[PDB]
Write a protein that binds this ligand. Structure first.
Ligand SMILES: COC(=O)N[C@H](C(=O)N[C@@H](Cc1ccccc1)[C@@H](O)CN(Cc1ccc(-c2ccccn2)cc1)NC(=O)[C@@H](NC(=O)OC)C(C)(C)C)C(C)(C)C
Ligand SMILES: [Cl-]
Lengths: 99, 99
């Protein structure tokens, strides 16, 4: 699709068989989801936004579908205000900015 | 232009006679710049991101040139780690997400 920006670019994602809403975020290096359960081991990461840094759990090679496009990559989990799809997965689904 | 997302989508902007680098940020409602002087009246605003909230000065009807495209809108000024071009100005230059 072509997504204009008059509203927040919110899409449906599917992860662990669950549907969630997430923000397509060109300003985010990483993908960060609200607290949830994921399989396997995790490693620590500190990520910095406006306001400061938060600690998150890093899971690698996670299956996630974004607006019907399949991706497999790193998903961070922690006290984010909103589910965020960052550039690590936007690139996998072939996202560009255009004007 | 078409901007891929392998790297941070940083572009040159011109604002208040100054050239600055800023991030094209579809995950931002607002445009927020590092400390600078702007003309006219302002009012305080709290904005929230990953690490909580910061206080900024809100200036309305500010002229900005983004990657060669002129726009007018509200610009917030304050302790952001990075210069951010948010949706309020991305719409004005006809910027879309495409995949
Ligand atoms: C290199 O660092 C990053 O990539 N940082 C990312 C990040 O925070 N990106 C910011 C822009 C940014 C980049 C680098 C340093 C600091 C900030 C945005 O792309 C992500 N984002 C994602 C985000 C969106 C909403 C909220 C939020 C916060 C409080 C209440 C409700 N929502 C938090 C994070 N948006 C906002 O924070 C915006 N907030 C906003 O539009 O609020 C409606 C601002 C900007 C206008 C403040 C992540 C931590 C998500 C990975
Ligand atoms: Cl505006």
């Amino acid at each position: 699709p072509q997504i204009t920006l008059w509203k927040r670019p919110l899409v449906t994602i599917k992860i662990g068989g669950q549907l969630k809403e997430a923000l397509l975020d060109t300003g985010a290096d990483d993908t960060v989801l609200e607290e949830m359960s994921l399989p396997g081991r995790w490693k620590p990461k500190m990520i910095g936004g406006i306001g400061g840094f938060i600690k998150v759990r890093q899971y690698d090679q996670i299956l996630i579908e974004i607006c019907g496009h399949k991706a497999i990559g790193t998903v961070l989990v922690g006290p984010t205000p909103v589910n965020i799809i960052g550039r690590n997965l936007l690139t996998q689904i072939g996202c560009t900015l255009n004007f």
